[PDB]
Design goal:
The structure is a homodimer.
Chain A lengths: L4 H16 L6 H10 L3 H8 L8 H5 L3 E13 L4 E12 L9 E11 L12 E10 L1
Antiparallel strand pairs in A: 1-2, 2-3, 3-4
Helix pairs in contact in A: 2-3
Bound molecules: 2-(furan-2-yl)pyridine-4-carboxylic acid.
PDB class: protein transport
Keywords: Fragment-Based Drug Design, Complex, Inhibitor, Antimicrobial Resistance, VirB
Assembly: dimeric
Chain lengths: 135, 143
């Protein structure tokens, strides 16, 4: 539907933070929220990295982490697309210092449309398209 | 849409900081929206107290107009979800248009009480407060 720019930027940036970060303790909720907030087509594309004994949570486990910081969020409400530019920083538990930051661009399409969704996606936020690219 | 005291850390933190920004900033080109957002997000008591400064020939926007502006910067947020209480430390920086530089920043502590209510809401009201967030108590003090 339509809820306002700042409401859009919250779910959009909260989505990027859920999907582009890695912390073993939070992968459960981070993984779940990405589902409700994604179309099944875009959802399975994300779930591909967690299947089998080679899944990210299985292979990486707790050895490292990756944090996200949002730097800008532009909107296009009539069309339902947004361009988010964020930065990630990786670090393994044994790492001496954090890895050099990496800059990214997220081209996203969103829309609005269960008791578990209460503390995750009450407004029915859903991402229909997603594409991350470097800078 | 529902009566709940909390919606989670990141959701509560969004509305609480949104409330402080709408109520503690001053932008003439936006004050009408801010004034409306604060009223929707507040109980009648909290709303009546806030709207006092806008009444009369000496209402805030009637006096200040576009001569000055004040922007907010959120520093930290501490939630007590079970009791609908939150502490928000923020900074304001005022710029008088008739000055070359800005005023010196001011630091504040906001003690707030919040809740969510399922209240009848029109289209334009749901577009701004979909989850029915509202402040039940509001007190600002310097730090
Ligand atoms: O000049 C200020 O810092 C100030 C103080 C109290 N309310 C406001 C305000 C403007 C629009 C909504 O709320 C601004």
């Amino acid at each position: 539907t339509s809820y306002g720019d700042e409401i859009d930027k919250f779910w959009l940036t909260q989505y990027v933070i859920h999907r582009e970060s890695y912390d073993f303790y939070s992968v459960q909720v981070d993984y779940t929220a990405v589902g409700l907030m994604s179309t099944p087509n875009v959802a399975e594309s994300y779930q591909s990295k967690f299947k089998g004994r080679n899944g990210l949570d299985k292979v990486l486990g707790d050895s490292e982490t990756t944090r996200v910081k949002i730097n800008s969020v532009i909107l296009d409400k009539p069309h339902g697309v947004a361009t988010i530019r964020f930065t990630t920083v990786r670090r393994v538990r044994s790492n001496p210092v954090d890895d050099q930051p990496q800059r990214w661009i997220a081209i996203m399409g969103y829309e609005y449309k269960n008791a578990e969704q209460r503390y995750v996606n009450p407004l029915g936020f859903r991402v229909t398209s997603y594409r991350v690219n470097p800078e």
